[PDB]
């Protein structure tokens, strides 16, 4: 019944016996003497000279006695004060070529130091404010920033860090959520969150335990002061070999709490940042005392940033909806809307769509959210979502706080931090920004664990590490293409299509020639599922034509800086030509489009970028055609006619791969045929949910895209294929006032496209596969 000799013990005592562990306070279940024996505060957290060599007094918070290292309960500055040693921060940086662990240590321990609400720009405050953090940052490995997951809230991001999964997959989709299968709500406050039913995937601590690696208790009751959390980690590190964990987590509530109170740019933020730096210094001094400072891998990481948000920048749903009593709103920096009593979702969305000129949120059905957010495939995510403008809140009805977070994860103010320091991380190395979903694999590598299946791309962060356990290999192609020749005659086709001599004289029309060389710069995409498709060559483009979907899976072409834009002539406006390499039965037909009043068509290779009048006729082949709503053609035609040439002019040429995506079940993965829920009327021509483009050029812009010796540069998009442009409030204006903005909102990683298409890109380059994996995870943010 007593905590004597049991403070912060690792074995969790079962109900009903009283507890002495990290979380006992949170369950209101600690022993009667917990707050006294375990949460001692007497004399503070720093040795003074007068305490050196004292006899142990049990009331003291930490000790300066000669027996204190045998418990790991010395104050962290003990040796500096009593043994003449220096502070870790005052020592010069010295590369750690190999781990330097003391006796009993099998592997380098990992410590995760997580800081809530630590905005990336706070790092600009430098060594005068944060000397310890700045040393870790400059001497180890760091990124300019780390991208969090949406929503940019604590619970979703801490659990993504732990699992390598998107919130839609791990289940922690918000700080607040409702599960219709449990008929219950999860909240930051309360007991509900402690039930295991909420938590999916496999977090790091469980991955560790399953593979024989001991994990410290990651979670800390808020009432445990930060100094005690550090001392407890150091005490655990002092345990015998068979009881000592290999992985630990420290969590701080700061700088989030001050961020909320004063905003991210308040002068009041300096003191919270100074205190966090002190805590880091305590940890590093503590490790130095135990001879672990050149043995431990340390990860200093945040969960999200902070934005200026005040109560007078609140949009109220009662100013748009006349029936606010019928809905339930999860409010704030995002909006999720649910019925109160199981109202009509389509009328709700319409009533929230572009109703005031300066409206500071936008409504979406979850399947229409930008696919980069990966925020749809979970029954806990409400069908109706509001994406709120940075600096604003949305509330149901009608300052103490000046900051908040939760917004779109590509917003600058939401970006957070990453520093890795220790023998396994690189020395004085800057790395590009990356997403927090990638760290679980690295933390597994750092511990010798096989990661559970997750949304990271294993190998994309090998460049953070001095030594790598995991070597990525490129997946094998599943479906091999056919390469059909000119087989059929014009007379054999009856597609109901029309058109308005020199092809006859060209014996090697549609042969490979130099097409593959100049239009497929990085090798053909591999098809990673089972299907039947044809490679088709042309002067200006190459494509992989699916005989199942009756359209290309991909279309590839290169446009030089100097390329000419031309118009579609009047006589070719409605031209569609049958492809003599592909059978009538595996082709689309024009009558289906005549029959379908809602549906039109577009082209994947644009007629506007043909190299000659002769070549232009290839662009009107039936095998280059794809179903497009008239509304979407305004977007697509502008992209094709105007933006591609712009990008070619800005980037010293570009290579473009475009194609359809089918994702009717909004799971972020390529649909099977059975999952396709819409076809062109009276046909088996499937309707894409989205269209992608991947735009590649040389990172060194002094080299043209087709003669690039080095690293590549990529931007990509996944555009929703919608029958209206309601998403774009300026869409009644000229396309130059809104199309490019739409596309930037739907920016994407090549990896996102790979999941949605079952294709593998960049299979033939001069770059290493790990470098390619980094390229595939890149997101062009426009921030
Ligand atoms: C993000 O990563 C997660 C985890 O890898 C992906 O979720 C996983 O998706 C696969 C494929 O749909 C699921 O596989 C299923 O396994 C069961 C096992 O019996 C099988 O019956 C099914 O036929 C199927 O093979 C798997 O359950 C699921 N895992 C988890 C933890 O949810 C997810 O697809 C990834 N997301 C993206 C956008 O890439
Ligand atoms: C900061 C406190 C107020 C809240 C404490 C965090 C709390 C939500 C933690 C405490 C215990 C955690 C669970 C436990 O570690 C084991 C598992 C097994 C694994 O399969 C899924 C995760 C789960 C259920 C943990 C979830 C997070 C819990 C509830
Ligand atoms: Ca799908
Ligand atoms: Na039509
Ligand atoms: Na509009
Ligand atoms: Zn917060």
Which phi and psi angles does 140 have, rounded to 5°?
-95, -140
Distance (Å, rounded) from C-alpha 698 to C-alpha 561?
A: 12
Closest ligand 1 atom to the C-alpha of 169?
32
Residue 520: which of 498, 499, 538 has the closest Cα? 538
Residue 59: which of 29, 30, 77, 38 has the closest Cα? 38
Residue 635: which of 725, 713, 702 has the closest Cα? 725
DSSP 8-state class, residue 720: E
Same domain, yes or no: 51 and 95: no
Residues 6+ apart with CB under 8 A from 521: 558, 655, 696, 705, 706, 708
- Interhelix angle for 154-163 vs 439-447, to 10°? 40
Q: Cis link prior to 16 (omega < 30° from 0)? A: yes
Residue 714: which of 432, 334, 317 has the closest Cα? 432
Task: Kindly state the tokens that stand for 186.
Answer: 């999860």
Distance (Å, rounded) from C-alpha 233 to C-alpha 72?
A: 9
User: What burial class does residue 146 get, using C-beta atoms within 10 Å of its C-beta: 0-12 exposed, 13-18 middle, 19+ buried?
Assistant: buried
Same domain, yes or no: 413 and 538: no
Distance (Å, rounded) from C-alpha 47 to C-alpha 287?
A: 16
Residues 6+ apart with CB under 8 A from 650: none
> Is 49 near ligand 2, meaning CB less than 6 Å away?
no
- Final residue of a domain: which of 28, 55, 85? 85
Concatenated DSSP letters of 4-22: TT-TT-SS-PPTTS-B-ST
Same domain, yes or no: 698 and 753: yes
Method of elucidation: X-ray
- Final residue of a domain: which of 470, 503, 530? 470
- Residue 752: how many CA atoms within 13 Å on its side-chain side? 26
Strands 334-339 and 247-255, how do they pair? unpaired
Task: Kindly state the tokens that stand for 153.
Answer: 């809230």
Distance (Å, rounded) from C-alpha 530 to C-alpha 480?
A: 9
- Interhelix angle for 226-237 vs 270-289, to 10°? 20
Which ligand number lies closest to the CA of residue 158?
A: 2
Strands 110-116 and 297-302, how do they pair? parallel
Residue 333 a catalytic site member: no
Cα separation values, 281 from 124, 274, 286, Å: 19, 10, 8
Q: Cis link prior to 151 (omega < 30° from 0)? A: yes
Q: How many domains does the chain have?
A: 4
CB burial readout 333-366, b (16+ within 10 A) else e? bbbbbbeeeeeeeeebbeebbeeeeebbbbbbeb
Distance (Å, rounded) from C-alpha 230 to C-alpha 250?
A: 7
> Is 203 near ligand 2, meaning CB less than 6 Å away?
yes
Gaps in the chain (C to N distance exceeding 2.5 A) after: 342, 398, 500
- Final residue of a domain: which of 23, 53, 85? 85
Residue 315: which of 279, 365, 360 has the closest Cα? 360
Distance (Å, rounded) from C-alpha 256 to C-alpha 232?
A: 23
Closest ligand 2 atom to the C-alpha of 195?
29
Q: What is the CATH number of the domain that holds 168?
A: 3.40.720.10
Residue 759: which of 657, 677, 690 has the closest Cα? 657
Which phi and psi angles does 407 have, rounded to 5°?
-65, 165
> With contact defined as beta carbons under 8 Å apart, do 403 and 308 qualify?
yes
How far away, in angstroms, is 455 Cα from ligand 1 center? Answer: 10
Residue with the two structure tokens 């829920």: 677
Same domain, yes or no: 421 and 360: yes
Same domain, yes or no: 624 and 703: yes
Strands 110-116 and 146-147, how do they pair? unpaired
Residue 414: which of 431, 441, 436, 396 has the closest Cα? 436
Same domain, yes or no: 501 and 370: no
For the chain, give the longest Cα–Cα distance. 104
Task: Kindly state the tokens that stand for 20.
Answer: 């002495």
How many other β-carbons are positioned within 10 Å of the β-carbon of residue 481?
17
Residues 6+ apart with CB under 8 A from 83: none
Same domain, yes or no: 295 and 284: yes
Distance (Å, rounded) from C-alpha 709 to C-alpha 726?
A: 43
How many other β-carbons are positioned within 10 Å of the β-carbon of residue 71?
14
Ligand-binding annotation for 303, yes or no, is yes
- Residue 177: how many CA atoms within 13 Å on its side-chain side? 23
Same domain, yes or no: 689 and 735: yes
Same domain, yes or no: 461 and 573: no
Which ligand number lies closest to the CA of residue 210?
A: 2
How far away, in angstroms, is 160 Cα from ligand 3 center? Answer: 22
The residues that bridge with 110 in the sheet, in sequence order, are 247, 297
Strands 247-255 and 418-421, how do they pair? unpaired
Task: Kindly state the tokens that stand for 486.
Answer: 């000119």
Ligand-binding annotation for 669, yes or no, is yes
Task: Kindly state the tokens that stand for 693.
Answer: 């483009």
Distance (Å, rounded) from C-alpha 67 to C-alpha 73?
A: 9
How far away, in angstroms, is 293 Cα from ligand 5 center? Answer: 58
Residue with the two structure tokens 């055609």: 625
| Span between the terminal Cα atoms of the chain, in Å | 57
- Nearest 5 degrees, angle CA 360-CA 364-CA 365? 160
> With contact defined as beta carbons under 8 Å apart, do 376 and 369 qualify?
yes
Q: What is the CATH number of the domain that holds 49?
A: 4.10.410.20
The residues that bridge with 557 in the sheet, in sequence order, are 656
Same domain, yes or no: 321 and 372: yes
Task: Kindly state the tokens that stand for 212.
Answer: 């024989």
Same domain, yes or no: 551 and 450: no
Ligand-binding annotation for 304, yes or no, is yes
Ligand-binding annotation for 326, yes or no, is no
DSSP H or E segment with residue 302: strand 297-302
Same domain, yes or no: 454 and 476: no
Helix (H, G, I), strand (E, B) or coil at 695: strand
Which phi and psi angles does 182 have, rounded to 5°?
-80, -20
> Is 27 near ligand 2, meaning CB less than 6 Å away?
no
DSSP H or E segment with residue 139: helix 131-139
Domain of residue 19 covers 1-39
Ramachandran region of residue 669, left (φ > 0), alpha (ψ -120 to 50) or beta?
A: beta
Q: What is the CATH number of the domain that holds 511?
A: 3.40.570.10
Distance (Å, rounded) from C-alpha 140 to C-alpha 280?
A: 14
Closest ligand 2 atom to the C-alpha of 218?
15
Strands 434-435 and 146-147, how do they pair? parallel
> With contact defined as beta carbons under 8 Å apart, do 342 and 183 qualify?
no
Task: Say how many residues make up the chain.
Answer: 783
How far away, in angstroms, is 738 Cα from ligand 5 center? Answer: 10
3-state helix, strand and coil shares in percent for the chain, rounded to the nearest 5: 30, 20, 50
Residues with CB under 5 A from ligand 3 (ion): 663, 665, 667, 669, 671
Distance (Å, rounded) from C-alpha 483 to C-alpha 485?
A: 7
Cα separation values, 295 from 97, 550, 699, Å: 11, 58, 37
> With contact defined as beta carbons under 8 Å apart, do 230 and 284 qualify?
no
Which ligand number lies closest to the CA of residue 354?
A: 5
Residue 489: which of 575, 579, 576, 586 has the closest Cα? 579
Residue 153: which of 26, 301, 306, 317 has the closest Cα? 306
Ramachandran region of residue 709, left (φ > 0), alpha (ψ -120 to 50) or beta?
A: alpha
Instruction: Show the ligand 1 pocket: residues with CB < 6 angstroms.
Output: 165-166, 169, 201, 374, 453-455, 668-669, 755
Q: Which position among 152, 154, 207, 416 bears the catalytic label? A: 154
Helix (H, G, I), strand (E, B) or coil at 725: coil
> With contact defined as beta carbons under 8 Å apart, do 216 and 10 qualify?
yes
How far away, in angstroms, is 225 Cα from ligand 2 center? Answer: 20
Runs of H (alpha helix) within 164-269:
167-170, 204-210, 226-237, 256-262
Distance (Å, rounded) from C-alpha 149 to C-alpha 176?
A: 16
Distance (Å, rounded) from C-alpha 34 to C-alpha 206?
A: 27
Helix (H, G, I), strand (E, B) or coil at 67: coil
Concatenated DSSP letters of 350-380: HHTSS-STT--EEEEEGGGS-GGG---SSTT
Task: Kindly state the tokens that stand for 717.
Answer: 């998009």
> With contact defined as beta carbons under 8 Å apart, do 719 and 635 qualify?
yes
What is the gyration radius of the CA atoms in the chain, in angstroms?
30
DSSP H or E segment with residue 650: helix 644-651
What are all long-range contacts of 121-124, with beta carbons under 8 Å and residues at least 24 apart? Answer: 121/264, 122/255, 122/264, 122/269, 122/273, 122/417, 123/417
Ligand-binding annotation for 260, yes or no, is yes
């Amino acid at each position: 019944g007593s905590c004597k000799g049991r403070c912060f013990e690792l074995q969790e005592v079962g109900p009903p016996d009283c507890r002495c562990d990290n979380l006992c306070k949170s369950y209101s279940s600690c022993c009667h003497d917990f707050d006294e024996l375990c949460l001692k505060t007497a004399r503070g957290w720093e040795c003074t000279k007068d305490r050196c060599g004292e006899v142990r007094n049990e009331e003291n918070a930490c000790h300066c006695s000669e027996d204190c290292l045998s418990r790991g309960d010395c104050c962290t500055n003990y040796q500096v004060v009593c043994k003449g040693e220096s502070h870790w921060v005052d020592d010069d940086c010295e590369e750690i070529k190999v781990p330097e662990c003391p006796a009993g240590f099998v592997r380098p321990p990992l410590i995760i130091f997580s800081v809530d609400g630590f905005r990336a720009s706070y790092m600009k405050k430098g060594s005068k404010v944060m000397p310890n953090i700045e040393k870790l940052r400059s001497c180890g490995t760091h990124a300019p920033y780390m991208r969090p997951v949406y929503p940019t809230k604590t619970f979703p991001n801490l659990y993504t860090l732990a699992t390598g999964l998107y919130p839609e997959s791990h289940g922690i989709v918000g700080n607040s959520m409702y599960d219709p299968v449990f008929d219950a709500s999860f909240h930051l406050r309360g007991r509900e969150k402690f039930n295991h039913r909420w938590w999916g995937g496999q977090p790091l601590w469980i991955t560790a335990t399953k593979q024989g690696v001991r994990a410290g208790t990651f979670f800390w009751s808020v009432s445990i002061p930060h100094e005690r959390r550090i001392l407890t980690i150091l005490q655990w590190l002092s345990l015998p070999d068979n009881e000592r964990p290999s992985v630990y987590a420290f969590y701080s509530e700061q700088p989030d709490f001050s961020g909320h109170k004063y905003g991210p740019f308040g002068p009041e933020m300096t003191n919270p940042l100074r205190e966090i730096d002190k805590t880091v210094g305590q940890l590093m001094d503590g490790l130095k005392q135990l001879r672990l400072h050149r043995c431990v891998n340390v990860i200093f990481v945040g969960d999200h940033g902070m934005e200026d948000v005040t109560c007078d920048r609140t949009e109220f749903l009662s100013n748009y909806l006349t029936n606010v009593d019928d809905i339930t709103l999860v409010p704030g920096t995002l909006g999720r809307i649910r019925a109160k009593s199981i109202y009509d979702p389509k009328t709700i969305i319409a009533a929230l769509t572009c109703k005031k000129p300066d409206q500071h949120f936008k409504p979406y059905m979850k399947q229409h959210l930008p696919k980069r957010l990966h925020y749809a495939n979970n029954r806990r995510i409400e069908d109706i979502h509001l994406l709120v403008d940075r600096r604003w809140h949305v509330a149901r009805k009608p300052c103490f706080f000046q900051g908040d977070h939760g917004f779109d994860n590509k917003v600058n103010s939401m970006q957070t931090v990453f520093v890795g320091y220790g023998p396994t991380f690189k020395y004085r190395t800057k790395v590009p920004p990356f997403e927090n979903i990638e760290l679980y694999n690295v933390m597994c590598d750092l511990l010798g664990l096989k990661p559970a299946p997750n949304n990271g791309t294993h190998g994309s962060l090998n460049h953070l590490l001095r030594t790598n356990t995991f070597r990525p290999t490129m997946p094998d192609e599943v479906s091999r293409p056919n390469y059909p020749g000119i087989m059929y005659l014009q007379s054999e086709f009856d597609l109901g299509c029309t058109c308005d001599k020199l092809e006859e004289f060209n014996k090697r029309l549609h042969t490979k020639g130099s097409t593959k060389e100049r239009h497929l710069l990085y090798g053909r995409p591999a098809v990673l599922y089972r299907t039947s498709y044809d490679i088709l060559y042309h002067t200006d483009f190459e494509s992989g034509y699916s005989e199942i979907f009756l359209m290309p899976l991909w279309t590839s072409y290169t446009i030089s800086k100097q390329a000419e834009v031309s118009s579609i002539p009047e006589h070719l406006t409605n031209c569609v030509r049958p492809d003599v390499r592909v059978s009538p039965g595996f082709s689309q037909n024009c009558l289906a489009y005549k029959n379908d009043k809602q549906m039109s068509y577009g082209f994947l290779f644009p007629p506007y970028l043909s190299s000659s009048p002769e070549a232009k006729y290839d662009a009107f082949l039936v095998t280059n055609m794809v179903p497009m709503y008239p509304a979407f053609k305004r977007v697509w035609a502008y992209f094709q006619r105007v933006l591609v040439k712009k990008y070619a002019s800005e980037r010293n040429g570009v290579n473009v791969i475009s194609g359809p995506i089918f994702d009717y079940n909004y799971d972020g993965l390529r649909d099977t045929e059975d999952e396709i829920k819409q076809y062109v009327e009276g046909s088996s021509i499937p309707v894409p949910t989205h269209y992608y483009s991947i735009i590649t050029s040389c990172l060194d812009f002094t080299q043209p895209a087709d003669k690039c010796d080095g690293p590549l540069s990529v931007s990509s998009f996944i555009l929703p294929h919608r029958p209206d442009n309601d998403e774009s409030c300026a869409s009644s204006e000229d396309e130059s006032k809104w199309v490019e903005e739409l596309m930037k909102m739907h920016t994407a990683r090549v990896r996102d496209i790979e999941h949605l298409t079952g294709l593998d890109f960049y299979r033939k380059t001069s770059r290493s596969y790990s470098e390619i994996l980094t390229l595939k995870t890149y997101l062009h943010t426009y921030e």
